[PDB]
């Protein structure tokens, strides 16, 4: 029987004048799943049911369980526990975010920024919609690979230090990549004014190529490359 230690961030808004602290739980790795989420569920079921976290698919394709494990930001159902018992796994919520309770952060600002970029097809004339299928050639379709797979786990944006200092005015890796997605979507006629929307110091130009977004992405996507690719389009469009 192998016993693993888990130190987890804890805060209760209902407790009178409570200060944020850490709490350690002991778990047998033979009667538990391989992933960190399985361990969190195990202590939820038996040890401590006060623990509060986001979870859904346990598959790594919904983005609910996004959190900070032993440093980086990854999905808890994708990251497997280190079998090395000599280390204590420290579990935190996403960095620089308002904690609602324990590992649950407020992502309201994150979703709100995603709305401001308009993530839907905009045609110049929509009198022929709902009847025709828009043609997109195989080569033009390939330009979406790496962009559409985004799950909105918010790991990349919350890994950005420039998002910690300016989380109100800087859109962040996740939202910025989706702007780019709808830019080269050759079915979208509104590519120009989408770029004109980023014509302020903060929206796009708070990026300084720190590359913490690309490194932490649990889906293996490259947000940083996409932001730099926008920057080029921004300098190369007329009228």
């Amino acid at each position: 029987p192998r016993i693993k230690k888990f130190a987890i961030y804890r805060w209760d808004p209902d407790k009178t004048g409570d200060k944020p602290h850490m709490q350690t739980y002991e778990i047998d790795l033979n009667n538990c799943g391989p992933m960190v989420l399985d361990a969190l569920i195990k202590i939820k079921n038996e040890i401590d049911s006060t623990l509060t976290f986001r979870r859904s698919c346990r598959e790594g394709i919904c983005g609910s369980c996004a959190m900070n494990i032993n440093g980086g930001n990854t999905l808890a159902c994708t990251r497997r526990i280190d079998t090395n018992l000599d280390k204590v796994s420290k579990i935190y919520p996403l960095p620089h975010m308002y904690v609602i309770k324990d590992l649950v952060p407020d992502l309201s600002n994150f979703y709100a920024q995603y709305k401001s970029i308009e993530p839907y097809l905009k045609k110049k004339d929509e009198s022929q919609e709902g009847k025709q299928q828009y043609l997109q050639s195989i080569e033009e379709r390939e330009k979406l690979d790496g962009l559409y797979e985004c799950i909105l786990c918010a790991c990349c944006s919350t890994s950005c230090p420039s998002y910690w200092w300016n989380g109100d005015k800087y859109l962040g890796p996740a939202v910025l990549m989706q702007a780019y997605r709808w830019m080269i979507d050759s079915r979208d006629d509104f590519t120009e004014e989408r770029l004109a929307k980023l014509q302020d110091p903060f929206s796009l130009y708070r990026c300084h190529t720190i590359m913490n977004c690309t490194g932490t992405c649990p889906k293996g996507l490259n947000p940083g490359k996409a932001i730099a690719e926008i920057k080029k389009m921004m300098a190369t469009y007329k009228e």
Partner: protein, 613 residues
């Protein structure tokens, strides 16, 4: 009761559930011009529709020239003649219309040399009414088709002034004198209780896969709208019909798509033989979901296992070209790498039949209106609609055909919106609710918040999941089902002896998972009682004792030179089940299936026949 703050909201239409079906109904209502409020316990993106990997069926005719009426025949043949043909007509005709609608919204569909949407071969489908070989009509965005569907529905839903109640757990329906008035909902975010009254209400809460121990469904797929309907004294249809998807990973119970089998994937047992040619001759490993899984679960009973305890079968993707897997099936290539710890291009993936889809649910006509059973007849419940997995327009019948559920979402979600737009106008009188209404739903919540018993939430949940897994499996006999029935009945009595720990208002997961447990149990009772009473083998429901397919006529031999069986004698009928919440007693009755189509001249009614692909 003086403790909880009641905040009343007023709207034109409420859509409980923000999945694939929920979104199409939500934004479609505001597209018509309704003051629409969407309630959801998850964020719209996190909904279980992201897990969808296969595709969405449409008879566009992109690979080979296609007709939609063949897709009609395939679905009703797959439904084992329990599917209501009026609904199947509407879905298969609106199939090319809805997919074109989704592609125009922004769905990044895979493409061919022609530049059109890429369709693929899938299990259950055939050309020329089951005569012209294999059919290719499964529209897909590589392998993240359902994920991309939910994203391009969400993105498009921000174009309209739809109000969203993100992370709001819907408790019960606001009901007065057999008329729907809205919903009472708990806000997980702070702990408050909100009564959201509207002239119409759409229930799209998805399936109840969490009732079992092993399933491909999410931790949130507990099927609560089904229980909300149940607690109102309304019936639930065909809840015994639980689809066991053949290809699910042995480890965590995750799903790998039928698209694996569609491209040219083969199922291999310990002998090395292609064992799916042994059972199914014409269709082979690309047949109905109940056919393939039935072979798999029987191969284990013999002793032909392939694991450390001889309990699972193998799915092989070794022979397929490496470039085919990288382009067409990348979503399953990465998920099988993590959970199974096994490569896709050289090594085979361990598969096991697991709980996947619930064709049963809330009784529904083709328009999307919720039906109740009065005097052996069908009555429409005023202002109550249902679409998606939680609904049961019985477009799937006894067995769902692959890649039809995403179609079920988009078509019937839209149909729910169109039915409201015609029956009433935006700005019509919103029915006033009683001041002391829904207080019993709050009283129920207050007990579980301060629950002090002997069994915990998790322990009683485990006792339910394991009991359903061992008893109500793929094969089930009367003696086994009856022991399970009284075992599930005992656990419902134990729901008064439950112990809780968290007393907080803000984010009480210890409380909401117990709210889910009450709703899971109610969905478990009707599943097990409906299964034990049904003395036939039809689709997914297979009795070892009665392997006979009982219809009105014996359709195996010539027709009309034959005696027609009475209604309470055969078993080609829907299972409507009520359950008294107070004592936990199941009382069930039956209603006939709809054979007529919407137009006989345009689409012929397909009579029951010998079913084997």
């Amino acid at each position: 009761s003086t403790q909880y703050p009641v905040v009343d909201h007023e709207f034109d239409a409420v859509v409980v559930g923000a999945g694939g079906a929920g979104l199409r109904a939500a934004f479609g209502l505001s597209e018509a011009g309704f003051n629409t409020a969407c309630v959801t316990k998850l964020f719209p993106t996190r909904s279980h529709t992201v897990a969808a990997q296969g595709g969405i069926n449409a008879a566009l005719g992109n690979m080979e020239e296609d007709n939609w009426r063949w897709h009609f025949y395939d679905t009703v043949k797959g439904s084992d003649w329990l599917g209501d043909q009026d609904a199947i007509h509407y879905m298969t005709e609106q199939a090319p219309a809805s997919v074109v609608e989704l592609e125009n919204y922004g769905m990044p569909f895979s493409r061919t040399e022609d530049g059109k949407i890429y369709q693929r071969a899938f299990g259950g489908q055939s050309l020329k009414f089951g005569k012209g070989g294999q059919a290719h009509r499964c529209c897909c965005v590589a392998d993240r088709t359902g994920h991309s569907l939910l994203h391009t529905l969400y993105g498009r839903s921000l174009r309209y002034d739809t109000s969203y109640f993100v992370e709001y757990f819907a408790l019960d329906l606001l009901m007065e004198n057999g008329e729907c008035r809205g919903v009472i909902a708990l806000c997980i975010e702070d702990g408050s209780i909100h009564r959201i009254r509207a002239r119409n209400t759409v229930v799209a809460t998805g399936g109840y896969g969490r009732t079992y121990f092993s399933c491909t469904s999410a931790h949130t797929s507990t099927g609560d709208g089904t229980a909300m309907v149940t607690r109102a004294g309304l019936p639930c249809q065909d809840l015994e019909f639980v689809q066991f998807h053949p290809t699910g990973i042995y480890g965590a119970g995750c799903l790998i798509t039928e698209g694996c089998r569609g491209e040219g994937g083969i199922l291999i047992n310990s002998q090395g033989e292609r064992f799916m040619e042994r059972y199914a001759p014409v269709a082979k490993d690309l047949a109905s979901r109940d056919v393939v899984s039935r072979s798999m679960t029987l191969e284990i009973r013999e002793g032909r296992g392939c694991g450390p305890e001889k309990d699972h079968v193998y799915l092989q993707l070794h022979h397929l070209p490496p470039e085919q897997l990288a382009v067409r099936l990348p979503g399953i290539s990465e998920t099988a790498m993590i959970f199974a710890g096994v490569d896709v291009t050289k090594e085979p993936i361990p598969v096991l039949p697991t709980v996947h889809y619930n064709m049963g649910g809330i009784p529904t006509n083709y328009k999307g209106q919720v039906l109740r059973h009065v005097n052996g007849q069908d009555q429409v419940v005023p202002g109550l609609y249902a679409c998606g997995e939680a609904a049961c327009a019985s477009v799937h019948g006894a067995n769902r055909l692959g890649a039809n559920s995403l179609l079920d979402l988009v078509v019937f979600g839209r149909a729910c919106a169109l039915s409201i737009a015609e029956s009433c106008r935006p700005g019509d009188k919103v029915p006033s609710i009683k001041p002391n209404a829904g207080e019993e739903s709050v009283m129920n919540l207050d007990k579980l918040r301060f629950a002090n018993g002997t069994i915990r939430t998790s322990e009683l949940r485990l006792s339910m999941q394991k009991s359903m897994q061992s008893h109500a499996a793929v094969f089930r006999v009367g003696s086994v089902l009856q022991e399970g029935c009284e075992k599930i009945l005992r656990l419902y009595g134990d729901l008064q002896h439950l112990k809780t720990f968290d007393r907080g208002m803000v984010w009480n997961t210890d409380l909401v998972e117990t709210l889910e447990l009450q709703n899971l149990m109610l969905c478990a009772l009707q599943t097990i009682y409906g299964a034990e009473a049904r003395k036939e083998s039809r689709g997914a429901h297979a009795r070892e004792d009665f392997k006979e397919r009982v219809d009105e006529y014996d359709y195996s031999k010539p027709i009309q030179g034959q005696q027609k069986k009475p209604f309470q004698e055969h078993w080609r009928k829907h299972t409507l089940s009520y359950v008294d919440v107070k004592t936990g007693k199941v009382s069930l009755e039956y209603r006939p299936v709809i054979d007529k189509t919407l137009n006989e001249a345009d689409c012929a009614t397909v009579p029951p026949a010998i079913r084997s692909y």
